[PDB]
Amino acid sequence: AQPAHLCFRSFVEALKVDNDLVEINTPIDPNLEAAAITRRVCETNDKAPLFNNLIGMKNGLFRILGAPGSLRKSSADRYGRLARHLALPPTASMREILDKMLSASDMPPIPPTIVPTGPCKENSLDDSEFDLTELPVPLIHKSDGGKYIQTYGMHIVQSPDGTWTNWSIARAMVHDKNHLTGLVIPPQHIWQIHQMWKKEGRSDVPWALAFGVPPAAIMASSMPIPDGVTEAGYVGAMTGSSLELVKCDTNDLYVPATSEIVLEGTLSISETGPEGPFGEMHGYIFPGDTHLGAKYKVNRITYRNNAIMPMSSCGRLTDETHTMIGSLAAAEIRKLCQQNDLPITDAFAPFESQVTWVALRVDTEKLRAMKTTSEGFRKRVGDVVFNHKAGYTIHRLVLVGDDIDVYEGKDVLWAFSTRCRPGMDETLFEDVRGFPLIPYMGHGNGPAHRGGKVVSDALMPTEYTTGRNWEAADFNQSYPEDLKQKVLDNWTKMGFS
Amino acid sequence: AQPAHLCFRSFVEALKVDNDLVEINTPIDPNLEAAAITRRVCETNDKAPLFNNLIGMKNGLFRILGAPGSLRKSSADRYGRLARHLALPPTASMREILDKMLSASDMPPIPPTIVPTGPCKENSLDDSEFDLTELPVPLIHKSDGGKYIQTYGMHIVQSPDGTWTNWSIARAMVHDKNHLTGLVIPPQHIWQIHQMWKKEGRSDVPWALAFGVPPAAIMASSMPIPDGVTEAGYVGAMTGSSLELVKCDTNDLYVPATSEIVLEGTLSISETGPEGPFGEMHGYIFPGDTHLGAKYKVNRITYRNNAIMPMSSCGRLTDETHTMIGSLAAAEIRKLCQQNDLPITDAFAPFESQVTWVALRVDTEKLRAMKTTSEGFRKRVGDVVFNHKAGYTIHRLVLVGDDIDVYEGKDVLWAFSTRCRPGMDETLFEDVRGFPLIPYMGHGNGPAHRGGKVVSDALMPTEYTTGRNWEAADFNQSYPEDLKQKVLDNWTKMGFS
Ligand SMILES: Cc1cc2nc3c(=O)[nH]c(=O)nc-3n(C[C@H](O)[C@H](O)[C@H](O)COP(=O)(O)O)c2cc1C
Ligand SMILES: Cc1cc2nc3c(=O)[nH]c(=O)nc-3n(C[C@H](O)[C@H](O)[C@H](O)COP(=O)(O)O)c2cc1C
Ligand SMILES: O=C(O)/C=C/c1ccccc1
Ligand SMILES: O=C(O)/C=C/c1ccccc1
Ligand SMILES: [K+]
Ligand SMILES: [K+]
Ligand SMILES: [K+]
Ligand SMILES: [K+]
Ligand SMILES: [Mn+2]
Ligand SMILES: [Mn+2]
């Protein structure tokens, strides 16, 4: 069998054909080595590593693919892995990736198709035959509090009433032979659904975790699509085809047919266990910071022959926690603003900001017609975004006018630094949900779960009134066209590079 | 001849030997073309252009050297032009450049030596023989309000009492055949001295403007060394040799003997004229924003045979306004903090911030012994720096701990973004002098000359108490040494770049 965006195995082959894979066929240790290689790949934008000979792999469990959604070295196909998740050309721009991820938002869902089997059923291990401590689960960072099996798989949970089935990524580590512990925190949909089952109080939550799912599905799993929306039908609509699912053996949830590895079991409504610390998206680990997390019981494993586990070695720039979490949040915030009648054209979370900022490009013609002010406009934008789930992970919003390409961090930093007067041009939001994972939040001076947010207005005064009143002091804007072309045409004759 | 740091002509030759020069011997227009080529060089870190055939050059006035203090493409000799100003190896780090610029601060001055002639006296034009509108003065940006002769020369003014002779860079444009207009603004030393002469009220200020001075001298001219300190003696001390000066023909000021071009005349204590707009350091020009500036009368020109005028085409990254203004201010702020008993080890103005921020590296062992808090420490640092001239051009200070290399913008941005909680971890300063050239100041929503400053504390809580409590989630810190070296040693065997 199938296309790369619909089948993870095909996706691996696509990375190979792209000359974007390195297959490592000698033995590699899942204790730190695989993740160290992965981390270095992410820091240097190298090819994705496929570990075909992992120390501890037994009976087909498992190979690892690192850096599945990380950056390539070239400018021209920078985002090519992300484009391979989506059937887009590998030279796709981030605007085009994010528009593809948003395209299903005003389409009818395409619900999924149930099929009686698939590759994910090629092998199975019951509750007497596996031990999660005996699989080659990686230790990703040297201070991690456990072996994090789950960095890039898909949790599947369903509302008690059956009407919403959510797919999302949330980390989890091995607790013991048949349990994991993981993050399940508000306002995430796995948490929202968990709360529904705990209020009902009758049973633990039926659960599955599918690794190596269809790449289109893992991207939606990382996106804050709306409350109540079933990701399978959104992915269906986005890709134009109904996803094929197979029922779990031990519960009534449905998993992608071509999933590499499937865990089936339950998410407890009563039990917790030690979880963390972990080397997280903002670039840190706090050794010894263990806290109680949600507890999962695993009842069954099913898997493809020669199964491959994807793994994100996350931390400092650049990995999936930046390219997918930040960009996909930004996409959804762009739509959210437009649906609130705000004149936002584009949004992106600058990597430079460790994806804690989102830059919002403003249609200043529309803003002018509003006949508003910075104070009022900043307040309106921050109230929309920081009161919504899509804004959770974002602590600063930077408003910029039409001359700025929000997908270019250098230009966002320029505009922030030169057009937003500290204090006066900003509004602080202390009574909104904060993201505790940011070190200044959970390890900072104030409440870990509240406040610490700001809207920074990098619109100039005349952008609200009569129009931009400057030209940039750059080659593009400070010279006439004919002169610029002469200069360019004579550049190498004169002796330049 | 003489050494490059003491003779501009030799400096040009040094750039040639370095394969860091392009000599353009075909005719180039000073109306925009020279500056467009220069601007492109600055935006791309290319070789410095030497325009040997400038349209309008007559009787030896003049050639142009663009981008004299801009960046080279290579990491290894990035700051090599700056090192060629100072007799440093071309691979010098910015720490080593700034330490060289600070080294004279606790040395006896070496006063200058008067010599009876020099190259700058090879040619002269009296008050009947030159016309500044007839020289090939550049139009640097298409919207500039005049032809800016003066971007990288040295103004020379002396206190009425004779005790302080100041050298500094401040822009100036041609007003008419025998006058310039320029910026003379508080708290700059040219302004301080001008105020002394206006209070005396007896005469205009004797003045000289020397272009193509000794490179060591132009660097000190761009540095905020202390009030009352004569730059010639500081440069003497920094270079270990007494600078040779020659007296002006028409006044009693002394100019470097090897100056390429010298204007002699007066800075008016009563007259003003239109000045600006200009494409400035923060990357903008506001067309039509002309204001009254200081007025200079030119009485005489003297110049070297085959004189060369240096020119800064300034604007967006990277030019002399960033590499020299920002870095040299940062240097002086590092010293200022240390002399105020603050535990600052290093300071740099990130280019990413358009040199409007300075990151201050804190010796956190010393900070711990202080037994203080963020609120108190931020207040103490901002009061020191924002109440001083060295802090003028800087609107945000970012305090970072010992793990951050302040000379690496990516690391400053990481620490700012992840360790400083907006609002709570910052202190705003509204009753300090502001820098009006920043667009958010002079073209912003608030007072152009006051406030808009902030100290942003990117120290984590335990950096004040018991010590850093994290490890970075990066290759360097999240893996043991033996493993990292294995990975590195096997990198290209495995198939990576
Ligand atoms: C590599 C990676 C790791 C992630 N880790 C977590 C995590 O541990 N906890 C979490 O709630 N979200 C995590 N996310 C982000 C969520 O997947 C994202 O917020 C998504 O919107 C959640 O789905 P939902 O909107 O259906 O709740 C991770 C995403 C990626 C790409
Ligand atoms: C290319 C360049 C252009 C500059 N333009 C100006 C200017 O127009 N006005 C100004 O006051 N300072 C200007 N500066 C900065 C001053 O030279 C710097 O603030 C210096 O500390 C002034 O000397 P002083 O401390 O003796 O007053 C410029 C510096 C450079 C490198
Ligand atoms: O463990 C991590 O690095 C990231 C976790 C996370 C939690 C909630 C939303 C987004 C990311
Ligand atoms: O004209 C410019 O771009 C820069 C001017 C300036 C003025 C005062 C201090 C530093 C720079
Ligand atoms: K999701
Ligand atoms: K603003
Ligand atoms: K000076
Ligand atoms: K802090
Ligand atoms: Mn969801
Ligand atoms: Mn001075």
Side-chain angles (χ1 to χ4, degrees), chain B residues 191-201 203-236:
Chain B
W191 178 93
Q192 293 186 203
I193 290 164
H194 175 264
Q195 293 285 114
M196 299 173 191
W197 289 80
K198 185 174 202 184
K199 289 175 194 156
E200 288 213 353
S203 78
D204 292 326
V205 186
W207 162 81
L209 173 54
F211 303 98
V213 298
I218 205 63
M219 292 281 289
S221 292
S222 186
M223 185 175 191
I225 75 170
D227 301 350
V229 179
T230 294
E231 282 72 10
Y234 186 96
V235 179

Side-chain angles (χ1 to χ4, degrees), chain B residues 151-152 164 166-172 183-185 187-190 218 220-225 231 312 314 319-321 324-325 389 392-393 437:
Chain B
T151 63
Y152 204 73
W164 175 20
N166 197 86
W167 293 354
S168 59
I169 307 180
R171 70 188 194 208
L183 294 187
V184 171
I185 64 184
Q188 299 292 66
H189 290 163
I190 190 168
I218 205 63
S221 292
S222 186
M223 185 175 191
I225 75 170
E231 282 72 10
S312 178
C314 55
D319 62 56
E320 295 71 28
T321 72
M324 295 168 60
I325 303 180
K389 173 171 171 299
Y392 168 55
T393 63
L437 275 68

Side-chain angles (χ1 to χ4, degrees), chain B residues 8 26 45 59 62 83 143 152 183 290 321 439 490:
Chain B
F8 182 86
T26 60
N45 305 339
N59 296 335
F62 40 68
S143 299
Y152 204 73
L183 294 187
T290 301
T321 72
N490 295 326

Side-chain angles (χ1 to χ4, degrees), chain B residues 345-366:
Chain B
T345 68
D346 290 275
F348 189 62
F351 298 128
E352 296 90 335
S353 80
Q354 202 73 18
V355 301
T356 70
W357 306 357
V358 161
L360 300 179
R361 187 173 177 273
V362 177
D363 180 332
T364 61
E365 185 180 32
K366 288 183 182 181

